[PDB]
């Protein structure tokens with residue numbers, strides 16, 4: 050087979066601040082029937098938009114951080130498990146996580162602790178309170194945003210030894226794959242008895258019932274590590290079932306797995322020395338740092354923007370990655386680096402954000 | 416590899432989708 054997915058650019062706009070847009074995420078927590086909403090992050094700004102019929106990109110709310118020198122690199126949506134109220138977490142150059150109420154567009158609270166900039170934020174797929182942050186300080190941190198606790202710090206002697214660029218939980222939230230500037234990819238199992246007990250303990254913590262601080266777990270050893278996939282920085286990693294997708298400067302998203310071809314991901318030991326490359330989703334001119342690929346909810350489509358305004362899309366249901374390419378999405382007015390893309394939960398819309406502050410709306414044909 | 420990995424994706428995303436279907440998150 051081949052890819053048949055087609056899209057048409059229905060709209061575009063440029064944010065008035067004129068600064069690079071570094072991140073974009075649709076709210077996948079919105080219920081069926083409710084409008085399709087996405088957040089963009091860039092400079093000290095967080096902006097909410099609604100995707101209307103006829104291709105309209107309606108500005109909903111604009112958050113401006115009081116710190117003019119803040120540079121947001123990422124955002125991630127969640128919800129309050131007690132009130133069903135949507136929440137948006139943002140972070141960047143200041144190394145501070147800010148939790149925004151997306152209805153009032155006000156910062157509710159912030160998490161200080163990382164010793165440098167935050168590159169990525171990911172919420173656990175089953176538990177909306179479990180927030181993972183990845184930093185230029187060489188560590189990953191797991192936070193419980195309901196009890197305001199630091200659950201764990203993933204770092205130390207066998208942790209990343211350079212700026213951590215990206216991380217992803219697997220579909221069921223049992224494990225994390227992370228990657229760094231020093232070409233290393235590391236696995237951290239969070240379904241261990243130690244991690245499961247730390248999560249339970251973070252739920253029981255309340256500073257009003259004790260004068261003692263909550264003790265975070267210090268995870269110094271990953272459950273697998275490799276520097277034998279890419280030859281340079283790895284700025285984006287995602288799970289594809291039990292397989293991994295990661296990219297470097299090579300103009301390809303590499304599909305690989307820990308161990309040999311037949312090895313089960315859950316039988317992989319921390320001393321595993323083998324790795325297997327399965328295939329490559331190739332593209333052009335995307336060899337500058339901080340360019341992220343995305344997938345739709347069902348993981349049927351893969352997308353990546355490049356440094357000259359082209360949006361590559363692949364069909365993940367075509368076995369051979371070399372043959373999975375969709376028609377590349379281009380526009381004569383879209384010539385700036387596309388930092389990140391986001392599909393709506395139903396995969397009907399694909400949004401791209403650029404270095405020139407522009408937003409591009411691509412609607413999928415049936 | 417591809418076929419069994421695709422089945423793992425289908426099954427695991429369907430669990431996430433069923434969990435989402437039970438939710439009524441307030442719109443923005």
Ligand SMILES: CS(=O)(=O)c1ccc(-c2cnc(NCc3ccco3)n3cnnc23)cc1
Nearest residue numbers: 069071122168169214215284285339340341
């Ligand atoms: C000189 S410029 O062109 O204004 C410019 C261009 C790019 C960036 C920049 C963008 N994204 C992330 N992180 C998110 C991320 C994406 C993949 C992994 O992690 N950063 C961290 N440090 N810098 C950045 C900042 C300034």
